[PDB]
Homo-oligomer: A and B are copies of this chain.
Amino acid sequence: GMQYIKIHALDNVAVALADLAEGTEVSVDNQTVTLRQDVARGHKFALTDIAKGANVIKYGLPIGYALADIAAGEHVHAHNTRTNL
């Protein structure tokens, strides 16, 4: 099966579908993303840089914002984002 799902075309995060190790390369939307941390199954990782204060877009919706600068390929979770739904 797929290692990740990118739920919606506008999303700047994808969800890991397996426990993915730091340094793993993923092919998403005709580009490559390299994980910068371990990302547990079900957790988000960044498809692009998400600057501090910038929206996390998931399901095509702004679901929250970054609490600090997040780099493409980093683990996105409670530590570095706030969810606003």
Q: Of all chain B residues, which has the CB nearest A62?
A: B42
How many chain copies does the complex carry?
A: 2
Cα–Cα distance between A57 and B15 once the two chains are bound (Å): 14
B1 touches A60 (CB 8 A): yes
Cα–Cα distance between A16 and B42 once the two chains are bound (Å): 19
Cα–Cα distance between A35 and B63 once the two chains are bound (Å): 22
A7: chain B residues at CB < 8 Å are 5, 7
Cα–Cα distance between A1 and B59 once the two chains are bound (Å): 11
A4 to chain B, nearest CB (A): 10
Known: A17-B60, A59-B15, A59-B17. A85 touches B41 (CB 8 A): yes
Q: At the interface, yes or no: A71 with Cβ under 8 Å from chain B?
A: no
